[PDB]
DNA sequence: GGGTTT
DNA sequence: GGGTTT
């Protein structure tokens, strides 16, 4: 049930227009975009639509990747000319820029003008085409009353020449869906969007400091800073039943400033001390393949070594398999190894030696048995309780005594598909001019993700959420946090301060220039 | 003056290892200045280490940063790494051997792990298993003021009093009570004192909020306090526009052994020294590098004029003998070679390497400001001769000439030259680097650097307060409410650390 | 303070 | 967010 307004935005995109569309939090911008992408792929070809957002989690929300990863620009810091040369040195990224017909960019408010101009420069040069983005069709989506770009001065995306020359058409949504049960809640949010909080709104938000329902549902929690988020995630993890599994990163290398090293290690995004349990909610923080990327969300199923996981995966791919195969692998692990390995640079092999000494195996420490929940896939004819496989699997797991046990994670994509991944340690490095590492880390590419920074929460729908505004420092940050909620009953707000909720005048000015959904219908009848 | 202040001095004189404390403005640093004199007469002038946690707080008592005194650099490595670094330096090794007393002011911004490392270094160097190798300790400060700064995501800071070194070394604690700085306003003192403990009632909040009114439009340039360097720099550059002079621009010169420009740009972000430094006659500045015994990080001064070294040598000669024979200035004016010969009569490879980078630090004529010719105005052919000598400097760097003032009120006239900063690998290879003047504008201060100052006229903007004790430090700099303006006061952002509350209950 | 990376 | 160095 897309609205008339939402569908008209899809049809304008179908007709080939360069559009920016927008609307308050939870007006269905990303939900419509999911549908739009399906039809753009049929117009341009499945691989010829770049699906992108300003953050990894917001990109995963629509089945896409970071604009940075897609473009091939890294952090995109330098001169446009250097970035273009960096991109064309990557055959994957050069072909992508030559081949795509459409570029979808969600949560665009966090992309600064300098980035937009450089992306435009890169597309024009690669495609040998002086049209606004080398002629790529533009679908820009977001709300500039939400978070602005991180400025580490930055200008908004709509201030760039690339924007003003590329964006042909704008459409504004008005109906709020996320909080549709509660019209008074919507008005509180919409005035907060514009920075205009009155006494009754302040009273109503301050009422929400009461704790959330005590149900067994683990709440989402939103904070301004990573230190708050990490503290809240590790707090929740300690409350989870179960033995903790600790993954201590291996850090190097040669940079002398100890503090600078730690600051740089932070932006590898995986923590120095990763603590995990069965059932922990985790986020992938490295771009590993097409569908396992920075922002992919998952749940820890158990901890297994690769040998145990091979048998488990074989069992989950054929539950009615005769247990004879599993018994051979139990009593003859050399055949498990051969069976497993039948299916599977130089400084690369020197990173594998470092990864070999990661999460070191304790030959003395007893291997806890597999949580019984992992055999539920079988346990949905009296002979057909030949689930002797379960004890066979438990034996094979005990034979992992003195081997490293990695988290098995079920990742869930935005289209609801799932993927089982035994998550291996990864490596991050910053190197000098002779390729010696200045700063390096080996760690699982995971972090706890019940709690989110408000930045990474932007784009999420959170039906049970606690928000602590104590450390908000950006315009729109408080609004993003509170507008994640679905119902007032599923929202707790701590440290609400109306003086720290103020909108950017440039955005107020810009939004008076935008066209309505009714003008969108007029364009469509003009189109056809 | 007070009996309480004198008795702290008497205890130190008697040899005790002392921590002493009290609310902001109780005279801890004023009494420290007299105590330092007494200790120097006991141990020897060079044998009392006078230090503090920040450069500006150190200058307030005629000292230097504890890091600079210790020889440990940034002081983040483990104890054995730092010990080797210190003893590898002969000046710092002799200091650690020779001093009989170590004075540390504003001790609340020093982490416990640093005190443990200094303890280790002192015991090893002096071959002595007593606390800090038998050095007498005088620690001073207020832990309800700012805590130690750490950018470590993984390890939280520990207050100095949590360290084994403190618990074993600090034998004696004294608490001062009478607040002197806000003497004539007893209600302001109560407002500040409960604010120190995180207690602010409705009436006190309304009182602070009333101080949003502007400060009087007298001739006096107010000091201005902000939480962040960005705010500080914006305020300093605003006030720089308020001065009538012509602007003088100093652009930094960057380099390093790195070739990947996106990493070099990622790393240059960290540097204190600006890409661009703007100065005028009369600008208030602060030295940010330790250059010699009395020109250090924290030295405050005022820009007099901008001169090349040839001109300054002439100006310096004139200020050192205003009843000069004018024939010398005419000779120098009409024969700059003789100027240089006289200049150089008074006077490596990697050092000549940067010294050639430094020669490229400037490049079109501009007459001097009439202020620099004060002479003895308490017949004057010397003035326009100096102007002539100046105009010949077309085509060379005209550096800021700065009048620095120490806390003892002694002044010092310095022509300030560029300096270097580098980020290095473990073999001291420079990865990225910057050449720039060791100066920043200093009308506005961060609240961190203000800790320890007394500011009779101050504007405070608390908008970006993020740290326990920060609002309290800012507002307690003021002498009177009449001299204080407060913007963006937030009572929720002022609560004390429970470990500090607990620590002081025991004293 | 906060995203972004073969 | 802030501070500390040749
Ligand atoms: N047309 C619609 N009908 C019913 N529910 C909708 C509709 N559009 C959006 N929603 C729901 O509202 C919520 C917010 O949608 P989303 O696309 O994330 O908002 P936005 O991207 O505008 O912030 C989602 O839970 C979505 O399922
Ligand atoms: N005994 C005293 N008599 C008069 N004024 C004093 C006395 N002690 C301190 N002061 C004044 O109070 C102000 C704060 O002193 P200071 O030592 O800077 O305080 P603290 O170090 O405790 O913050 C200074 O201006 C100082 O001149
Ligand atoms: F605008 Al949204 F989730 F994308 F609130
Ligand atoms: F405690 Al102070 F200036 F040293 F307020
Ligand atoms: Mg969205
Ligand atoms: Mg003091």
Question: What does the alpha-carbon distance between residue A103 and residue A131 come to, in Å, rounded to a whole number?
Answer: 14
Q: How many CB atoms lie within 10 A of CB B294?
A: 14
Answer whether B181 contacts ligand 2 (Cβ < 6 A).
yes
Question: What does the alpha-carbon distance between residue A382 and residue A377 come to, in Å, rounded to a whole number?
Answer: 18
Contact B54, B60 (CB under 8 A): no
- Look-up: residue for tokens 């902001």? B24
Long-range contacts of B312-321 (CB under 8 A, 24+ apart): B312/B399, B312/B401, B312/B415, B313/B339, B313/B342, B313/B343, B313/B346, B314/B339, B314/B386, B314/B389, B315/B372, B315/B386, B315/B401, B316/B413, B318/B382, B318/B386, B319/B413
Residues lining ligand 5 (ion), CB within 5 A? A 29-30, 459
Residue A484 alpha carbon, nearest atom of ligand 3: 5
Q: Are strands A273-276 and A406-412 parallel, antiparallel or unpaired?
A: unpaired
Residues constituting chain B: 507
Half-sphere exposure of B414 (CA within 13 A, CB side): 23
In angstroms, the Cα distances linking A369 to A223, A302, A318, A432, B364 are 36, 10, 22, 45, 82
Stated as kind and residue range, the H or E segment containing B286 is strand B284-287
Nearest CA in chain B to A429: B263
Nearest to A46 by CA among A106, A108, A121, A99: A99
Question: What does the alpha-carbon distance between residue A223 and residue A235 come to, in Å, rounded to a whole number?
Answer: 14
Nucleotide nearest to B422 (CA to C1'): D6
Answer whether B29 contacts ligand 2 (Cβ < 6 A).
yes
Tokens read off for B301: 């001064």
Nearest to A31 by CA among A52, A7, A15: A7
* Phi and psi, residue B434, nearest 5°: -145, 135
Tokens read off for B453: 């100052």
> B279: which strand partners?
B248
Q: How many CB atoms lie within 10 A of CB A176?
A: 21
Q: Is A259 on the interface with B (CB under 8 A)?
A: yes
Question: What does the alpha-carbon distance between residue A431 and residue A437 come to, in Å, rounded to a whole number?
Answer: 4
What's chain A's Rg over C-alpha atoms? 25
In angstroms, the Cα distances linking B317 to A236, B310, B311, B321, B375 are 72, 11, 10, 6, 12
Q: How many CB atoms lie within 10 A of CB B348?
A: 7
Q: Which of A226, A256, A272 sits opposite B425 (nearest CB)?
A: A256
Nearest CA in chain A to B270: A260
| Interior angle at CA A447, CA A442 and CA A453, nearest 5 | 130
Tokens read off for A406: 């990695």
Mutate to test the interface with A, among B228, B233, B254, B263 (most CBs of A within 10 A): B263
Q: Are strands A406-412 and B248-251 parallel, antiparallel or unpaired?
A: unpaired
From the CA of A423, how many Å to the C1' of C5? 19
- List, in sequence order, the alpha helices (H) in A105-179: 113-127, 161-166
> Across the interface, do A263 and B431 touch by the CB < 8 Å criterion?
no
Taking only residues 201 to 240 of chain A, the set having a beta carbon closer than 8 angstroms to any beta carbon of chain B reads 226-227, 230
Close Cβ partners of A459 (under 8 Å, ≥ 6 residues apart): A30, A53, A55, A57, A58, A61, A106, A107
Answer whether A414 contacts ligand 1 (Cβ < 6 A).
no
* Phi and psi, residue B424, nearest 5°: -125, 160
The answer to whether A150 CB sits below 7 Å from nucleic acid chain C is: yes
> Across the interface, do B76 and A259 touch by the CB < 8 Å criterion?
yes
Long-range contacts of B67-76 (CB under 8 A, 24+ apart): B68/B290, B68/B296, B68/B297, B69/B95, B70/B96, B70/B118, B70/B121, B71/B95, B71/B96, B72/B117, B72/B118, B72/B121, B74/A257, B74/A258, B74/A259, B75/B114, B75/B117, B76/A257, B76/A258, B76/A259
Cα dihedral B83, B88, B94, B95 in deg (nearest 10): -50
Burial of A501 (0-12, 13-18, 19+ CB in 10 A): buried
> Across the interface, do B263 and A430 touch by the CB < 8 Å criterion?
yes
Nucleotide nearest to A257 (CA to C1'): D5
3-class secondary-structure state, position B137: strand
Stated as kind and residue range, the H or E segment containing B276 is strand B276-279
> Which residue's CA is the nearest one to ligand 4's atom 3?
B452
> A302: which strand partners?
A408
Tokens read off for A319: 């539950």
Answer whether B454 contacts ligand 2 (Cβ < 6 A).
yes
Task: Give the determination technique.
Answer: X-ray
Tokens read off for A57: 């989690």
CATH number at residue B96: 3.40.50.300
In angstroms, the Cα distances linking A510 to A104, A480, A515 are 21, 19, 11
- List, in sequence order, the alpha helices (H) in A181-297: 183-193, 199-206, 226-239, 258-266
- Is B29 annotated in a binding site? The answer is yes
The helix, strand and coil proportions of chain B, stated in percent and rounded to the nearest 5, come to: 40, 20, 40
The answer to whether B150 CB sits below 7 Å from nucleic acid chain D is: yes
Alpha-carbon dihedral sign for residues A6, A9, A10, A11:
positive
Would you give the DSSP letter of residue A436?
-
Residue A23 lies in domain: 4-173
Tokens read off for B431: 């990865």
Q: Is A429 on the interface with B (CB under 8 A)?
A: no
In angstroms, the Cα distances linking B210 to A24, A198, B214 are 37, 22, 10
Close Cβ partners of B89 (under 8 Å, ≥ 6 residues apart): B71
Nearest to A480 by CA among A20, A65, A24, A27: A24
In angstroms, the Cα distances linking A34 to A37, A39, A147, B138 are 5, 9, 22, 67
Stated as kind and residue range, the H or E segment containing B64 is strand B64-65
Nearest to A80 by CA among A113, A52, A51, A110: A113
Residues constituting chain A: 528
Nucleotide nearest to B146 (CA to C1'): D2
Q: Are strands B458-461 and B223-226 parallel, antiparallel or unpaired?
A: parallel
Question: What does the alpha-carbon distance between residue A462 and residue B478 come to, in Å, rounded to a whole number?
Answer: 47
Question: What does the alpha-carbon distance between residue B228 and residue B447 come to, in Å, rounded to a whole number?
Answer: 8
State how far Cα A449 lies from the chain centre: 10
Q: Is B274 on the interface with A (CB under 8 A)?
A: no
The helix, strand and coil proportions of chain A, stated in percent and rounded to the nearest 5, come to: 40, 20, 40
Question: What does the alpha-carbon distance between residue A41 and residue A376 come to, in Å, rounded to a whole number?
Answer: 38
- List, in sequence order, the alpha helices (H) in A405-476: 454-457
Q: In what order do the strands lie in the sheet with A426-431?
A: A250-252, A437-443, A426-431
> Across the interface, do B77 and A258 touch by the CB < 8 Å criterion?
yes
Nearest CA in chain A to B491: A497
């Amino acid at each position: 049930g897309l609205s008339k307004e939402q569908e008209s935005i899809i049809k304008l995109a179908e007709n080939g227009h360069n559009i920016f569309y927008t609307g308050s939090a939870g007006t269905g911008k990303s939900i419509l975009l999911r549908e739009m992408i399906k039809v753009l792929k049929g117009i341009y070809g499945r691989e010829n639509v770049a699906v992108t957002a300003s953050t990894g989690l917001a990109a995963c929300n629509i089945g896409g990747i970071t604009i940075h990863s897609f473009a091939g620009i890294g952090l995109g810091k330098g001169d446009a000319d250097k970035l273009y040369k960096k991109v064309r040195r990557s055959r994957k990224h050069l072909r992508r820029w030559e081949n795509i017909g459409a570029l979808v960019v969600d949560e665009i408010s966090m992309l600064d003008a300098e980035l937009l101009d450089k992306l435009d420069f890169i597309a024009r040069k690669i495609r040998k085409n002086h049209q606004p983005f080398g002629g790529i069709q533009l679908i820009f989506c977001g709300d500039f009353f939400q978070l602005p770009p991180v400025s580490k001065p930055t200008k908004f995306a709509f201030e760039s020449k690339a924007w003003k020359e590329g964006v042909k058409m704008t459409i504004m949504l008005q109906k709020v869906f996320r909080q549709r049960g509660d019209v008074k809640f919507i008005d509180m949010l919409n005035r907060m969007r514009l920075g205009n909080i009155d006494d009754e709104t302040e009273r109503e938000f301050k009422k929400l400091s009461r704790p959330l329902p005590d149900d067994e549902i683990i709440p989402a929690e939103l904070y301004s800073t990573r230190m708050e988020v990490e503290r809240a995630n590790n707090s929740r993890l300690s409350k989870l039943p179960g033995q903790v599994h600790i993954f201590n990163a291996i850090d190097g290398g040669a940079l002398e400033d100890e503090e600078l090293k730690e600051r740089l290690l932070q932006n590898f995004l995986a923590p120095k001390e990763l603590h995990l349990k069965v059932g922990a909610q985790v986020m992938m923080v490295k771009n590993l393949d097409a569908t396992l990327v920075n922002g992919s969300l998952g749940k820890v199923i158990e901890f297994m070594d690769p040998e145990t996981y091979f048998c488990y995966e074989a069992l989950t791919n054929d539950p009615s398999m005769p247990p004879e195969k599993l018994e051979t692998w139990a009593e003859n692990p050399s055949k498990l190894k051969a069976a497993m390995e039948r299916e599977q640079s130089a400084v690369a092999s020197r990173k594998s030696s470092v990864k070999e000494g990661f999460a070191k195996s304790d030959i003395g420490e007893p291997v806890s048995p597999l949580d019984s929940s992992v055999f539920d896939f079988m346990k949905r004819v009296v002979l057909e309780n030949i689930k002797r496989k379960e004890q066979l699997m438990q034996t094979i797991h005990q034979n992992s005594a003195g081997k490293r046990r990695l988290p098995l994670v079920r990742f869930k994509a935005s289209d609801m598909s799932t993927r089982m991944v035994l998550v291996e340690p990864e490596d991050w490095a910053i190197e000098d001019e002779n390729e010696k590492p200045l700063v390096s880390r080996v760690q699982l590419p995971l972090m706890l993700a019940w709690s989110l920074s408000i930045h990474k929460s932007q784009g999420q729908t959170l039906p049970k959420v606690k928000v602590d505004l104590r450390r908000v420092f950006e315009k729109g940050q408080a609004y993003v946090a509170l507008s994640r909620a679905v119902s007032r009953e599923g929202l707790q707000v701590l440290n609400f301060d109306r003086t720290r909720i103020k909108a950017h005048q440039k955005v107020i000015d810009f939004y008076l220039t935008l066209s309505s959904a009714e003008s969108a219908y007029k364009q469509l009848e003009a189109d056809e």
